Structures are given as structure tokens and as C-alpha cells.
Amino acid sequence: SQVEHPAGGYKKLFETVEELSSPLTAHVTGRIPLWLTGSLLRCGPGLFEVGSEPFYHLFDGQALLHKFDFKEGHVTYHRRFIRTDAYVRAMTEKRIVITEFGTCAEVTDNALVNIYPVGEDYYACTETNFITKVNPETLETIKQVDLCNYVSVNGATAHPHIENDGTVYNIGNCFGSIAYNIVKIPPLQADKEDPISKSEIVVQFPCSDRFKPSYVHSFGLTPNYIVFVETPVKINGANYMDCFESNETMGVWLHIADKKRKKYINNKYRTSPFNLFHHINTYEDHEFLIVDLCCWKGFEFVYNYLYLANLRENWEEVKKNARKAPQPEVRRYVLPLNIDKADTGKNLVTLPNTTATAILCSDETIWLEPEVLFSGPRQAFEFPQINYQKYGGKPYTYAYGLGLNHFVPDRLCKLNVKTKETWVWQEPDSYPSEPIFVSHPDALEEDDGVVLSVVVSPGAGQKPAYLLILNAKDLSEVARAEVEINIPVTFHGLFKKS
Amino acid sequence: SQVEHPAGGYKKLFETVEELSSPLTAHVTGRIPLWLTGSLLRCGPGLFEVGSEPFYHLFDGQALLHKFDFKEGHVTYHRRFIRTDAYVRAMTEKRIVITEFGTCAEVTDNALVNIYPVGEDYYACTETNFITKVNPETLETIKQVDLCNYVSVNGATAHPHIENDGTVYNIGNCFGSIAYNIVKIPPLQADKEDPISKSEIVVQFPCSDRFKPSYVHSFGLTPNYIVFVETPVKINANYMDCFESNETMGVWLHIADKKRKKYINNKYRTSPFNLFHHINTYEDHEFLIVDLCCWKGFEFVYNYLYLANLRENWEEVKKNARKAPQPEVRRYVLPLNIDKADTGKNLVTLPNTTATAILCSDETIWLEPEVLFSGPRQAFEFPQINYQKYGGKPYTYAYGLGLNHFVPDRLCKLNVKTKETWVWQEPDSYPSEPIFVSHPDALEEDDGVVLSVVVSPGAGQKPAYLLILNAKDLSEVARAEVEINIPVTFHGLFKKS
Ligand SMILES: [Fe+2]
Ligand SMILES: [Fe+2]
């Protein structure tokens, strides 16, 4: 039954740490596969107060860039704070200078969320117009880039999609009346000029409210389509959180655009209210789009439950605080691309392998019901990853995720989206991070590889943290690389093959 | 993967049979439990045309009453047509005289759906104002009873709830404005006066549409509450011609206080589905747990149940179900206490569910379900539980008939707490709803058997049989085989002796 955490080890995820001057050698137990060569780069908050001035929210602490390097069975660990305007000015003025998502002190450039490649460069990011070029070898900070210099968006998510050729797609709200713009950044060309200088708006999605865009964290992409899910979480001494509100009547509107023709498709897909942070995968199956999502049932903003004061409470209180929260659920939606009026009033989802439905109404809305893939009481399958390079945007079978127990990460999970079978890794008093998949270079199968996760493990005698390596087939442990220092929460990252 | 039925044996479910003059001895294989003593009584259509005039719909064929009797490890089988007005007048005139659900030929009394007890008596029914008293031992027809003689309802469902003392609750629409009335029939008293004569209206549920009641097939009952689910299938020629789907209402859920006989004005709402069968309902702290066999969408599922379509070859049957609503077992959780300080939040604070209920500003309470079972075009339907001991109470197990693009082809058990399932199936065998009988010394909820009637047409095979499975694991315990066909049956009961 229910896994419990009375010792309160999870509080270490939210405790300030010091950066390192140089990389440190981790102590390896088991055997790290010799084909595993490259760097796991991850981002998280690393400084949770400036002197006696606290940051209040999980998404406020100062960006810290982490690196595990793998070479010939050996592992090192390094971390450096990102020298953003937020961090530099805070160090200079010795106070909180720039307003953060949930702390009132100029838009924040605190890139604590993710890192991604553009041409030969790498950028750490949050969700604003500012991204920060960083050196993936040394973790030094290179420069600040303002997306507003190049394209018409107010911000951009921390979850761009990267195509196999290096083309980058993202979404942000804009003044197209409010709208949402898809931005494309090209691959590096022979001239080698900055791909960001060649950014353009591909297509625009309409907004459900003239003056209130929904909060958008991620989106879906296939070879031929772009999918955007417009939730009821709306943006209306203030901080960013103060601007959010819930629309009680709209439910969720889903939108598709033709990627190659750069055209919005006026299909009115609709469903019941949920929050959404992470798309899992999206693909085309006959004339339908399969849309796999990590949902939170309800319209209250899940971020209201992620203040540091609440995440640092003792365990019975953490559980109590999540009692009225939206419930997490992995759902498959299926969107028909062909809408035939002759079928008005019927289920259009004629696929053999799903219980998802899509009902064509007389007013032309298309009401969707999901196929539930995974559902546990206050137990989220979240921070989803797939074999993205080979199966992103395509028919697939496996997803990896971080299991959240009343919002505390405490296990790693694998899901067969076809059969709903699951696998789990967990250890008492250990709190893992998002799992990243690395394929065996010569794999022909989808799940022939490892997953990497950073695990916090406070306790008498124990090494305080470690990089965990699991077999992707069954989440069995292959190795771990232990370090002698704490590592705070990290949200997203990547594995750069070397 | 997909189970296929190319041979097309299911067609025998919809083929006319003759009644019997007296009980046949069935051939036993395995072991009939020695503690099983009594009669399995079931109803279904048994005559699917009158001469050259066809009945069109699965719910039109003339009611046939079936009995398997169990005593000391042996089994007999008997069946007789119910001598309703519809059957008798059809026999007298050698044509279809009374309009049926889906066949235009004066309300039908064709009691082909179910049988239940009232005091010392048994009644076969359909969904109208007419129920037919019948003799459970000989299968003879005794009397037509018009419920309109006793209480104001236009009809009543074929799924009354029956409390342990014999009190019968049912629901039917009435001319309140349209409304829905809960009828209560008391237990037999010391006078032995006909309990129907003492029928009364307990409480009334309001209707979403002033002139259009929803179709109601069943309802929920607990010790303290009555639960009614108002679906988008509306009643605005034959009966089927009067149905329409309301596209924008979704589903409205309703509760009434059973003991205080009071409607509770809580506006529970959710997305559109058809509902035929409640599974079970119970109370858990301040919440009603409502377990349902749903069909996702607002098109009326009965549109897919015309005999011409159910008698097609298997590739065509599958094709015909492509755009049908998808079946899904769902758990909804209804908060009984609504606090306005929680507006905008999930009220379902229970530890063991992912069902939600969000209090909106307009006072509507938007529900999302916990899904318990879901398979593509594969329904868990005709649900049954250990009803005497667990009906209306916290429970763990449900039994059902599995429908494969509307063709019955397997038996299923579901643990509603863990979602574990068990299945019984055999090629070219088409079972009926499974009915649970407790072992006399039962310590656990699933200490017992399920009984199902199975059709198995084929070269060198007995055409039909009573199947007995162990309720613990759905492993086969025995069969009682007969040498004649048995058409589809919908519902029934086991009457202990
Ligand atoms: Fe994210
Ligand atoms: Fe029924």
C-alpha cells in the first residue's frame, strides 16, 4: 500500500548548496556500461534564499547547472551557478533584485528549468523571453539572449521540440488580441551564422479569451502536425503567480496545425478541465492524432501546491496539504483529422486499439474522452521521457517517468502505453529525479539502453546523493555513482553524447 | 489480442425456439455443488417472428421464462413462454398485435427482461406499467398487474432493488412537469395482503427537461441514499422512434435521502455517457461511491441492437460497431457535504481513489471518474455482485458478461479495489449474465459460484449448457448440458430452496 516518508529526507531537495570549483570523482558501485560516453546535463534551483531574504516557490531559486560526465566506466560530478542577471545582481546587491515566479523583489532570466541545443550551442532556459547560452564542458555562462530581439513572442516554454536535423520548434504567447505563436529555429547552415538570427514564426494558434492566454508548458509535434492544449489555467508588489486564475467553464480546448503547410486547422476539439505540464508523445495513426499527456484532473493551478514552505513540511502535513489537490492521471486522447458531417452525433474514433472517443456535435465541437493509461491516488507519473531521438513524434510503446507521492518524488516508473504494464524502481528515503533514456548506440529495439536519474539519499552513514543507472528493459539497477555532497532538486535536462 | 467469431455461432442467440411440456434432465459434467439447491430463473426473447412478420429489435421477441433446477448434484431444464397479452393475442391472431420496443404492430406487457420477488410472489417484467405474476415452480403465467392501478408512474425499470426484508424500491418517470418517482413496495405483512396494494411514492427526482424524461434502466441504493443518473438519452411508430440524444447536457447525477424521503439539491454533473447498469453503490465517510457500466458518448446504444445487425457475419458485426460509444467501467465519487470555502477545489479527500469532484462558482459539482476497466469495444456488462450481503455496502468484487462488439463471448470478474481481472472463455461459446450464489458457510465475499447459461452451436457439440464457475477464480466447476438451443437471456435470479 501507501509508501511513507516520516524521516523527511525530501527536505534536502530544497536546501541551498555551494557550487564546485572543478569536477569531482564519483565513487562507482556496480559496472557502468562502456558504451556510455557523454554528459548528463540538468538544471534546478540551487540557492533558495539571498542572505535573510527567502525565495517562496519551487520555481524561484537560483539556477544551478549540473553535469555528470561518463568516460570508460568512470564518472565525475560538477556544478556551477548560471551567471544570469538575476543571480549576478543578487550577488552584487546582496538581496533579491529581480522578481521570480513566486517571490516579489525587469523579467526574470533565472534559467532553472531546462537546457537545450541550438546549432552548435546550448541554452539554459526558464519560460520567459531570456535564455542563457552556456558552455556544456565547463558550465561557464556565455551570454544572455533576448528572444524578443528576434521574434514576436512574450515568452517561450522550456520544452522546445528538436527535430533530428536540429531544427527547433517552440511556442509562446504573443500579441498576434492575444494569440500563441509557433517559433522555428533552423539547423546550423554552412555559413554558420547564428541560427537564432534566422528564427521565424511558423503558424499562430488562436486564443479562447481575447485578453487572457492560458499557461502553456509544453506542446506536441509529429512530422506533419503541431498539437497545442489550451487549458483553463489563465494568465490575467505582484509576482508571476499572482497573475494566474482558473476559468471554470471552458474546460480544455485542443488545437492542431499542419506543420508543413504552416496552417491552423479549425477543428474545435473540446474536453473536460485539466492542468497539463508535460506531453508524453504525439503521433499519427491513419487519419488520427494520438496525444499522450500527463494530466491533473481539475482547473485549480497545481503550482499553488508547490510553495517551498509546504514542500518542506513534515510528511503527515505534506499528505494533508495534497488532499484537495487535482489528481494526476496519464491519458491518451485521439483526435480525428477527418470530420465528416454525415457522422454528426457519433464517435469518430474508429481505431481498433483504443477506448478513446471523439463525438461530433451539431455545433461542430468535437467532444473527446480519454483512454486512461495510468492512475494512482495522489501518485503521479510525471516528468515523462521516451526514446525521443528515434520515437518522438512517431508510433511508440514505452515512457519513463518520475513518480510523485503527494508531490514528493520517490520512485521511478516505466509504462508500456499499449498494455498499461508498469515497472518501478524505488528505495526507502531516496528521492530520484526525472529519468533520462540513453539508447545503446547499436540498438534496434525501443527500450535497449539505460535510464539515468539523480537521487538524493540523506541519512546517517549514507552517501548524500548519487547518479543512478538502470536497465531500460526492466528498471533493474546496473550501477550508481555516489558523491559526498547534497544535490538539490533538478527539473529537466539531457544527455549529450561525446 | 482480438478474439474472433468467424463461424458465426452467436446467431443462435437470436433464433426462435419451442417451449417444453415438462423439465428435461441435463447431462452433468464435473460436480454440481451439493449445497446448491434451488432454481435459476431467467428471462429473454424466445420467439423472434410471428409467421412471416419479423420482430426487428433485440428487445421485441416474446418473453420466454427459463428454469434450471438444482438438487443433490443433478439438474433439470424447463422453459415456457409467458402468456402475456402480447403473446396470447399474437397466437390468437397469427400476427404481431402489440407494438414492441422496435417493431410497430396499447402498451406492451412483453415481460422479456427480468423476474423479481414481491412478498411471496414472483413477477416477470419489462420496462412498462405492466408486470406479469408467474409461478416459479411450474413456469405458468398467473396474472397481469397494471402498476398504474396502484401508483402514479408511467412505467418502472426491470431493475428494482430488493432490501434484505423484502422491501422493493423502483424508479419510473411520471407527470409531476415530467419527473421521476421512487416507488416503494413493502414486505409481506402478517395479513398476507398483496404488498403491491400498499405501494407508495417515496420521493421524486426533478427532470432536466420539462417535457423530456431521460431513459432510465437502473438506479443505485444504499442504506441511507438513493442515486439516480440522468443521462442524455431522452424520450421525446414504435418506442425506439421516440428517443433522442441531448447534445449539451452531459450527465446529471442526483441523490435523495432514503430515510427522510427528501431530494438533495446537489448539482452533480459530468460528461456524456449512456448508462444501463449500476454495479453497486455505497457510503464511505462523507461520500457516495457510485460504480457504473458506462458507454462513452450520447448516441443511444440501443441503435446497435437490431436483430438484422446482430445476425450479420463477424466482419460486418465488427464494422457496425466502429462508431459506437465505447464501454467503460467507471467509479464516481459524490461528496455529500459541500462547503463553499472549497469553491474551485477537488472535494474528494478519500485516500484510495483518483475520482474527483470540483465545486464550481455556479454551485455545480463537476465529477471525473476513476476508470476501473476499459477494453476497445469490449464491455464488462450485465454486472452482478454478492448482492444479499454486499449490495449497498463496501465491496470488492463484481462479475460480468463480456461483450465483443456487442456479442457476448466471455465471463469476467473484477476486483474494484485493485482492478485485477479474471476471465473465463471457450471458442464458439456465448455466455449469459453470471449470477452469484453464496456458499452456505461463506467467510469471504467471493466464497461461492457463478451460474451462466451458455450457447455452443457446432459439429458434434451439445447446443447449450448451464455453466458453473468457482467465484474465487472463475475456474470451471461443472456443466449441465442440454440437447436443445437456448436463446439470449437478459436477467434473472437464483431462488434458494
Ligand atoms: Fe517541465
Ligand atoms: Fe438490464
Whether A273 and B366 lie within 8 Å, measured CB to CB:
yes
Q: Which of A1, A3, A247, A248 to mutate to test the interface with B (most CBs of B within 10 A)?
A: A248
- All cell numbers assigned to A455: 537521487
* CA distances, A56 to each of A53, A102, A305 (Å): 10, 6, 12
Q: Which of B304, B167, B168 is nearest to B240 (CA)?
A: B304
* A267 touches A339 (CB < 8 A): yes
Q: Using a CB cutoff of 8 Å and minimum separation of 24, what contacts does B141-150 make?
A: B141/B82, B141/B83, B141/B84, B144/B84, B144/B85, B144/B109, B145/B196, B147/B172, B147/B183, B147/B196, B147/B199, B150/B196, B150/B197, B150/B199
Question: In this structure, are residues A1 and A43 in contact, taking their beta carbons and an 8 Å threshold?
Answer: no
B161 is in an annotated binding site: no
- Put simply, whether A352 touches B (Cβ < 8 Å) is yes
Opening angle at CA A209, ends A206 and A212, nearest 5: 105
Per domain, the residue ranges of chain A are 1-498
Quickly tell me which residue has 467501467 as its cell: B329
The count of C-alpha atoms lying within 13 angstroms of the C-alpha of B457, restricted to the half-sphere facing its C-beta, is 15
Q: What is the DSSP letter of A292?
A: E
**In 3D, which of A189, A229, A195 has the Cα closest to residue A213?**
A229
Distance (Å, whole) CA B485 – CA B470? 25
Distance CA B300, CA B331 (A): 21
B323 three-state secondary structure: coil
CA dihedral A199, A202, A205, A210 (to 10 degrees): 50
Note whether A328 and A379 are within 8 A (CB).
yes
CA distance B439 to B452: 17
Ligand 2 centroid distance, CA of B319 (Å): 25
Of A147, A189, A185, A181, nearest to A163 (Cα)?
A185
Q: How far apart are the first and last CA of chain B?
A: 43
Answer yes or no: are the C-beta atoms of A254 and A228 closer than 8 Å.
yes
How many alpha carbons fall within 13 Å on the CB side of residue B28?
A: 18
Task: Extract the C-alpha cell encoding A295.
Answer: 494530466
What gap in Å lies between CA A7 and CA A1, rounded to an integer?
A: 18
* Strand segments (E) across A55-94: 62-71, 74-81
Rg over alpha carbons for chain B, rounded to the nearest Å, is 22
Distance from CA of B89 to the nearest CA of A (A): 39
Handedness of CA B96, B99, B105, B106 (dihedral sign): positive
* d(C-alpha A493, C-alpha B391), whole Å: 52
Check if the beta carbon of residue A282 is closer than 8 Å to that of residue A289.
Answer: yes
Interface list for B 218-247 with A (CB within 8 A):
245, 247
Contact yes or no for A300 and B345 at CB 8 A: yes
A 365-384: CB under 8 A from B? 367, 369, 371-372, 375-377
A48 CA distance to ligand 1 centroid (A)? 19
**Residue B377 contacts residue B405 (beta carbons within 8 Å):** yes
Q: Are B284 and B395 in contact (CB under 8 A)?
A: no
Q: Do B371 and A376 touch (CB under 8 A)?
A: no
CB–CB contact A347 B325 (8 Å): yes
> Is the CB of A348 inside 8 Å of chain B's CB atoms?
yes
Identify whether the C-beta of residue A434 lies closer than 8 Å to the C-beta of residue A454.
Answer: no
Resolution of the experimental model, in Å, one decimal? 1.9
Give the Cα separation of A12 and A464 in Å (integer).
9
Residues of B in contact with A340 (CB under 8 A): none
First and final C-alpha spacing in chain A: 42
A150-179 burial, b if ≥16 CB within 10 A, otherwise e? bbbbbbbbbbbbbeeeeebbbbbbbeeebb
Distances (CA, A) of B421 to B396, B406, B413, B424: 12, 20, 5, 10
**Which residues, in sequence order, are bridge partners of residue B454?**
B465
CA distance A461 to A459: 6
- The three three-digit cell numbers of residue B404, written as one number: 465483443
Q: Which of A234, A249, A297 to mutate to test the interface with B (most CBs of B within 10 A)?
A: A297
Q: Scanning every residue of chain B, which has its alpha carbon at the shortest distance from the alpha carbon of A363?
A: B247
CB A476 within 8 A of CB A470: yes
Write the residue in A361, A369, A377 that is nearest to B271 by C-beta: A369
Please name the residue that has the C-alpha cell 543571480: A87
Distance B490 CA to ligand 2 centre (A): 7
Q: Which SS3 state, helix, strand or coil, does residue B91 take?
A: helix
B128 C-alpha vs ligand 2 centroid, how far in Å?
Answer: 14
Q: How far is the CA of A72 from the centre of ligand 2 (A)?
A: 67
Of B278, B292, B356, residue with least CA distance to B329:
B292
Q: Which helix (H) or strand (E) holds A423?
A: strand A422-425
Asked if A371's CB is within 8 angstroms of B374's CB, the reply is yes
Give the span between the Cα atoms of A73 and B465, in whole angstroms: 66
Rg (CA), chain A: 22
Q: DSSP character for B463? A: S
C-alpha B245/C-alpha A347 separation (Å) is 13
d(CA B249, CA B298): 10
Distances (CA, A) of A497 to A27, A36, A139, A493: 22, 8, 16, 13
Ligand nearest the Cα of residue B216 is 2
* Spatial CA neighbour of B277 closest among B333, B205, B234, B329: B329
Which of B245, B296, B344 is opposite residue A300, by nearest beta carbon? B344
- Verify whether the Cβ–Cβ distance B351 to A327 is below 8 Å: no
Task: Output DSSP code: residue A327.
Answer: E
What determination technique applies here?
X-ray
Concatenating the DSSP letter of every residue in A138-205 gives T--EEEEEEHHHHSS-S---S--EE-TTS-EEEEEEE----EEEEEEEPPP-TT---GGGG-EEEEEE
| CB contact B354 to A (< 8 Å) | yes
Distance CA B396, CA B418 (A): 9
What are the CA-CA distances from residue A162 to residues A29, A159, A389 (Å)?
34, 9, 9
CA distance B270 to chain A (A): 9
Compare CB distances from A354 to B327, B344, B376 and report the shortest one's residue: B376
B277 belongs to an annotated ligand binding site: yes
CA of B226 to the centre of ligand 2 (A): 18
Task: Check residue A412 and give left, alpha or beta (phi > 0: left; psi -120 to 50: alpha).
Answer: beta
Using an 8 Å CB-CB cutoff, list chain B residues near A348: 323
Rounded Cα–Cα distance for residues A45 and A39 (Å): 20
Runs of H (alpha helix) within B245-297? none
What's the rounded Cα separation, in Å, for the pair B113 and A398?
45
Give me the residue from A324, A357, A359 closest to B342, CB to CB: A324
Take residue A250 and report the three cell numbers written for it: 471552458
Across B140-214, the runs of DSSP E, i.e. the strands, are: 141-146, 161-162, 168-174, 179-185, 200-206
List b or e across B168-202, with b for residues whose CB sees 16 or more CB atoms inside 10 angstroms: bbbbbbbeeebbbbbbbbbebeeeeebbbebbeeb
- The reply to whether B265 touches chain A by the CB within 8 Å rule is no
In sign, the C-alpha dihedral spanning A49, A53, A58, A60 is negative
CA of A486 to the centre of ligand 1 (A): 23
Instruction: Give how far Cα A148 sits from Cα of A151, A155, A195, Å.
Output: 5, 8, 15
Report yes or no: B338 at the A interface, CB cutoff 8 Å.
no
Q: How far apart are CA B490 and CA B66, in angstroms?
A: 11
Q: Which residues contact A205 (CB under 8 A, 6 or more apart)?
A: A171, A179, A180, A181, A182, A228, A230, A255, A257, A264
| A355 interfacial to chain B (CB closer than 8 Å) | yes
What gap in Å lies between CA A34 and CA A30, rounded to an integer?
12
> Smallest Cα–Cα separation from A68: which of A426, A479, A395?
A479
Q: Is B162 helix (H, G, I), strand (E, B) or coil?
A: strand
Query: A387: Cβ–Cβ under 8 A, 6 or more apart, which residues?
Result: A396, A398, A437, A439, A446, A447, A449
B285 is in an annotated binding site: no
**Binding site feature residues of A for Fe cation:** 159, 217, 278, 492
Structure letter (DSSP) for residue A309 = H
Question: CA-CA distance, B420 to B397, in Å (whole number)?
Answer: 10
Measured in angstroms, the CA of B215 and the nearest CA of chain A are apart by 18
